[PDB]
Design a protein around this ligand. Structure first.
Ligand SMILES: COC1=C(OC)C(=O)C(CC=C(C)C)=C(C)C1=O
Ligand SMILES: [Zn+2]
Lengths: 145, 188
């Protein structure tokens, strides 16, 4: 799928990353998790498992079976709460990376949160990303799995 | 046989001395904090089950609401210092969060006045060393239990509250399941 993703890389990837730092906007916390359950596919099937060799791409099948997946509920759970809030939840300003692998401090500039309380088309931000996190799911599941 | 780390609570890696007995954080800005305290009054329920008349503290947080939260905190720093609290909780939630009728220092000021707080006796404490100290030590207090999100909670400066390792579908239930986990971690 390197063709899709090379032009999801050189066409879709940073229409994200930029076109926020473009108007210099503040993220959230889920934000960069969704940026991670993203830039951890458009990098994790490029230099990933459709790979620098394209005979065997069922490693990328699981790289999509359970990565586009996170991207789904990250956005979903996120978007759930927008006028429909929930007791046992939180709302943060700080972020994490277990495995002593450390997102934040590697790229201070883009792996960073700033937790706060607009508009994107006939929508706003997060839903508009389920419009692709769940899009690049089924119409990507279909042809491979 | 049945009480699990990472489950109903999580113990702190770097724990903190002189810390309060139970130390719920919260903003007047988390629709969840609202849900937590204003809808479920978990605070009160925890109080209830609580062991032998025990320090049920509650601090406010700065991040959300930027420049306003800052004063909303300071306001509250007072509200503890007096303190009305109880009297200023409900309306300030109801203000800022639910109706969007609070604009800054004085809107808050008003909601104190209006709630039985003496006009500028509120301002009489607001600049008292009493409440500088209070504020600063609810920054410190958060930075200590290394904080990120709110609502939060910490038994005796040791145990981060995990509301997860508990029923999530049943309200009446999760509450008592929450309030319980406290009675436990306290006398422990
Ligand atoms: C609602 O807040 C969010 C942003 O606002 C600055 C983002 O930039 C981003 C990153 C933007 C894209 C298009 C992936 C996300 C995921 C987000 O949730
Ligand atoms: Zn009620």
């Amino acid at each position: 799928a390197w063709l899709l993703m090379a032009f999801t890389a050189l066409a879709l990837e940073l229409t994200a990353l930029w076109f926020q730092h473009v108007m210099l906007l503040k993220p959230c916390v889920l934000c960069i998790y969704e940026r991670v359950a993203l830039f951890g596919v458009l990098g994790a099937a490029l230099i990933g498992a459709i790979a620098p060799k394209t005979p065997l791409r069922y490693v990328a099948m699981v790289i999509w079976l359970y990565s586009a997946f996170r991207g789904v509920q990250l956005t979903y759970e996120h978007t759930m709460l927008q006028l429909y809030p929930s007791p046992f939840a939180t709302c943060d300003f700080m972020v994490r990376f277990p495995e002593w692998l450390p997102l934040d401090k590697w790229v201070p500039q883009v792996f960073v949160a700033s937790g706060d309380s607009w508009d994107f088309l006939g929508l706003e931000m997060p839903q508009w990303l389920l419009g692709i996190f769940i899009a690049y799911l089924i119409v990507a599941v279909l042809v491979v799995i | 046989a049945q009480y699990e780390d990472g489950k109903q609570y999580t113990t702190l890696e770097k724990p903190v001395a002189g810390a309060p007995q139970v130390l719920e954080f919260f903003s007047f800005f988390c629709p969840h904090a609202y849900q937590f305290e204003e809808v479920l009054h978990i605070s009160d329920n925890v109080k209830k089950k609580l062991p032998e008349g025990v320090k049920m503290t509650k601090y406010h947080v700065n991040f959300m609401g930027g420049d306003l939260g800052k004063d909303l905190t300071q306001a509250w720093a007072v509200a503890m210092a007096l303190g009305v609290e109880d009297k200023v909780t409900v309306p300030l939630f109801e203000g800022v969060q639910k109706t969007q009728t609070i604009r800054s220092a004085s809107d808050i000021r008003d909601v104190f006045i209006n709630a039985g707080i003496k006009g500028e006796e509120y301002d009489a404490a607001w600049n008292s060393f009493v409440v500088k100290s209070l504020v600063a030590q609810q920054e410190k207090a958060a930075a200590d239990v290394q904080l990120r999100g709110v609502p939060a909670m910490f038994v005796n400066g040791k145990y981060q509250l995990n509301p997860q390792g508990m029923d999530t579908s049943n309200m009446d239930v999760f509450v008592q399941q929450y309030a319980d986990t406290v009675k436990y971690l306290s006398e422990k």
